[PDB]
């Protein structure tokens, strides 16, 4: 009977790996999807292996495993923290139902096929506001997530999705070996902070108006173009490791986060703000690579 | 709705297919049962260790905790072994400074100061002196203090390479020029490629240059005699293409590959 089913549904919800609290509020469709996915999940894991609150809190992102056809069969608990959307709300649904259509094709091909490794950026819906608060699903913003993992045998894609911290909104501490820069959309320097001098030897005045591409080691230029286009197309990007030519010979290793900055009043793309992570001291200090170094 | 009930069933069906004690059954039990055979079946049974396992799969990450005041490692997960080729025994009880590049020591010192969220990038040693780039994410938890963090990994002469402005001027050369043409980078930089070409070949070189620009983006190869540091005329093939700005499609520079023939 209805009564008699409503009893076991509750029995099922509370024995879901969930708080009695949240377990208690599920409609029945969800209890299915969450239970199902828990078993689905449990089946992938035994295939791989043969204080979670810590792990969950050390994460700067959430974990997802997604089937070759797009179903999100598991999503780690702390995603709500990043996307607003909770584990319960999404589990068992199609990834494509929550990602920018302009990326669906891309996602599809990352879901598919013989290297197993996967690394890409994806725009996913976020309903938590910069600084705490929350919005409705219609009032969703697009959030870029950096995804890294492996495609693995029915296939699965097992990825980590990290948000890229917004330069105007920083929860997180910065050390010495980091400097800021601003660019036009073609990545020409439009600003560079005084720390660059100490870090690489350039004066901002020497960099202003100068295209970023001429300070890249050339072996890297093609690869950075990809970062640029990603940044533009999706709004944020993380570059690979790259060498930047230093004022007096040699180069430094870098990793850069870039964000397109918008005018909140006229909604124009105003500029690119870059957080540049310097990964080394100057290497091949002896070798002069470019004309600028002459100065 | 119609398909409402159908998908509960597909769910239900799915459930029994997946509850072995229910699945191994002669025929399919009812709604109320499967509902209470799954309950019993998980009341048997994400794993605590598994969340950790997924990280390794996904992010090639491993966990570690270090005392903040000293940097003493109060714990390292064993995943340091698959991640770093490093024994927990090599890692547990130690100092993070022992584990990073001497140049990451400073950067490391600033991360562990009394203050929150922490996050950084550094080079760590792996052993059988080799370093790898590791992204560290984590937070400060008292333990006078400890750092809870995850380190994860990242995804990745016959000739010499040059970049030019569209005029033929050298604006960038790799150290192999010395090997290829005997010149110090300084000796090539700032001078026109034309200035290094044999008179009888110079228009082809210019021809080449007018063409690769005009035939934007694409490669064109051209062969000419280059004057070594020792002045002897060297046969060379360079294949080159124009490089355009991804945003503006302005030509950033010409990229050349210059191969000793």
Q: How many residues does chain B have?
A: 261
Which candidate from A33, A36, A291 shows the least CB-CB separation from B189?
A291
How many Cβ atoms sit within 10 Å of the Cβ of residue A146?
Answer: 21
Smallest Cα distance from B246 to chain A, Å? 6
Number of Cβ pairs < 8 A linking chain A and chain B: 209
Domains defined for chain A, CATH in brackets: 2-163 (3.30.450.20), 178-294 (3.30.450.20)
Displacement of CA A149 from its chain's centroid (Å): 12
Residues A256, A243 contacting (CB under 8 angstroms): no
Residues B134, B153 contacting (CB under 8 angstroms): yes
Beta-carbon separation of B103 and A281 below 8 A: yes
Residues A125, A143 contacting (CB under 8 angstroms): yes
Both structure tokens of B259:
């191969």
Residues A39, B34 contacting (CB under 8 angstroms): no
Best residue in B39, B45, B116, B141 for a mutation probing chain A (most A CBs within 10 Å): B39
Which candidate from A51, A55, A279 shows the least CB-CB separation from B55?
A55
Q: Where are the beta strands (DSSP E) in chain B?
A: 61-67, 73-76, 117-125, 131-142, 145-152, 159-164, 170-173, 219-227, 233-244, 251-260
Beta-carbon separation of B189 and A219 below 8 A: no
Residues B84, B62 contacting (CB under 8 angstroms): yes
Contacts of A108 (CB under 8 A, 6+ apart): A70, A96
**CB contacts, 8 Å: B171 with chain A:** 214, 290-291
Q: Where are the beta strands (DSSP E) in chain A?
A: 62-67, 72-75, 117-126, 141-152, 156-163, 178-183, 189-192, 236-238, 242-245, 251-262, 269-278
**CB contacts, 8 Å: A28 with chain B:** 8
Q: What angle in degrees, to the nearest 10, is found between the helix axes of A28-49 and B31-44?
A: 40
- What's the CA gap between B63 and B75, in Å, rounded? 8
Smallest Cα distance from B191 to chain A, Å? 10
* Burial of B194 (C-beta count, 10 Å sphere; 0-12/13-18/19+): middle
Residue of B nearest to A151 (CA): B58
Residues A111, A157 contacting (CB under 8 angstroms): yes
Return the closest-CA partner of residue A177 out of A161, A158, A193, A156: A193
Classify the C-alpha dihedral A85-A145-A171-A270 as positive or negative. negative
Return the closest-CA partner of residue A182 out of A256, A252, A113, A244: A256
Beta-carbon separation of B121 and A186 below 8 A: no
CA-CA-CA-CA dihedral for B66, B72, B74, B76, to nearest 10 = 70
Contacts of B26 (CB under 8 A, 6+ apart): none
- What's the CA gap between B48 and B52, in Å, rounded? 7
Experimental method: X-ray
Which candidate from A58, A228, A281 shows the least CB-CB separation from B138?
A58
The rounded radius of gyration (Å) of the Cα atoms in chain B is: 31
Residues A12, B32 contacting (CB under 8 angstroms): no
Smallest Cα distance from A41 to chain B, Å? 8
Residues B173, B164 contacting (CB under 8 angstroms): no
Beta bridge partners of B170: B164
Beta-carbon separation of A186 and B245 below 8 A: yes
Residues A251, A243 contacting (CB under 8 angstroms): yes
Max CA distance (Å), chain A:
86
Q: Residue B255, SS3?
A: strand
Which candidate from A39, A221, A277 shows the least CB-CB separation from B18?
A39
Resolution (A): 2.4
B39: containing domain = 1-44
Residue of A nearest to B47 (CA): A42
């Amino acid at each position: 009977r209805r009564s008699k089913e409503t009893e076991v549904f509750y029995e099922l919800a509370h024995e879901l790996p969930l708080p009695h609290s949240v377990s208690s509020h599920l409609d029945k469709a969800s209890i299915m999807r969450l239970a199902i996915s828990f078993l689905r999940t449990h089946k992938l894991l035994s295939s791989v292996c043969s204080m979670d609150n810590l792990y969950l809190k050390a994460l700067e992102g959430f974990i997802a495993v997604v089937t070759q056809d797009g179903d999100m069969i598991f999503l780690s608990e702390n995603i709500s923290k990043f996307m607003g959307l909770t584990q319960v709300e999404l589990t068992g649904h199609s990834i494509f139902d929550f990602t920018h259509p302009c990326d669906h094709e891309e996602i599809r091909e990352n879901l598919t096929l013989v290297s197993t490794e996967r690394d890409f950026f994806m725009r996913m819906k976020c309903t938590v506001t910069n600084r705490g608060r929350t919005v409705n699903l219609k009032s969703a913003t697009w959030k870029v997530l950096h995804c890294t993992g492996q495609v693995r045998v029915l296939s699965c894609l097992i990825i980590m999705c990290e948000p890229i911290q917004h330069p105007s909104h920083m929860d997180i501490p910065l050390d010495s070996k980091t400097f800021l820069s601003r660019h036009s959309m073609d990545m020409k320097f439009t600003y560079c902070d005084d720390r660059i001098l100490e870090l690489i030897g350039y004066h901002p005045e020497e960099l202003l108006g100068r295209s970023a591409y001429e300070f890249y080691h050339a072996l890297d230029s093609e690869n950075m173009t990809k970062s640029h286009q990603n940044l533009c197309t999706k709004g944020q990007v993380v570059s690979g490791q790259y060498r930047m030519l230093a004022k007096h010979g040699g180069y430094v290793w870098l990793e850069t986060q870039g964000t397109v900055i918008y005018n909140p009043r006229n909604l124009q793309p105003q500029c690119i703000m870059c957080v540049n992570y310097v990964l080394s001291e100057i290497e091949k200090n002896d070798v002069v690579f470019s004309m600028d170094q002459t100065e | 709705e119609r398909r409402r009930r159908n998908k509960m069933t597909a769910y239900i069906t799915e459930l029994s297919d997946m509850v072995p004690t229910c699945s191994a059954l002669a025929r399919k039990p009812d709604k109320l049962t499967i509902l209470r055979m799954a309950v019993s079946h998980m009341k048997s049974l994400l794993t605590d260790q598994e969340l950790k396992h997924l990280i390794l799969e996904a992010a090639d990450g491993f966990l570690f905790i270090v005392s903040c005041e000293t940097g003493r490692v109060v714990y390292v997960s064993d995943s340091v072994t698959p991640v770093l080729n490093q024994p927990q025994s090599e890692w547990f009880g130690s100092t993070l400074y022992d584990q990073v590049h001497p140049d990451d020591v400073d950067k490391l010192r600033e991360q562990l100061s009394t203050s929150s969220r922490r996050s950084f990038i550094c080079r760590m040693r792996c052993g059988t002196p080799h370093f790898v780039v590791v992204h560290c994410t984590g937070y400060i938890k008292a333990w006078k203090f400890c750092l809870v963090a995850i380190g994860r990994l990242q995804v990745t002469p016959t000739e010499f390479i040059s970049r030019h402005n569209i005029e033929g001027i050298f604006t960038f050369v790799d150290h192999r020029c010395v090997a290829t043409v005997g010149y110090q980078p300084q000796e090539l930089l700032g001078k026109n490629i034309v200035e290094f070409c044999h008179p009888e070949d110079q228009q082809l070189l210019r021809d080449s240059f007018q063409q690769v620009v005009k035939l934007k983006g694409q490669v064109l190869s051209v062969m000419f005699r280059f004057r070594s540091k020792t002045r002897e005329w060297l046969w060379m093939r360079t294949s080159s293409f124009t490089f355009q700005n991804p945003y503006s499609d302005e030509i950033e520079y010409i990229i050349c590959t210059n191969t000793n023939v």
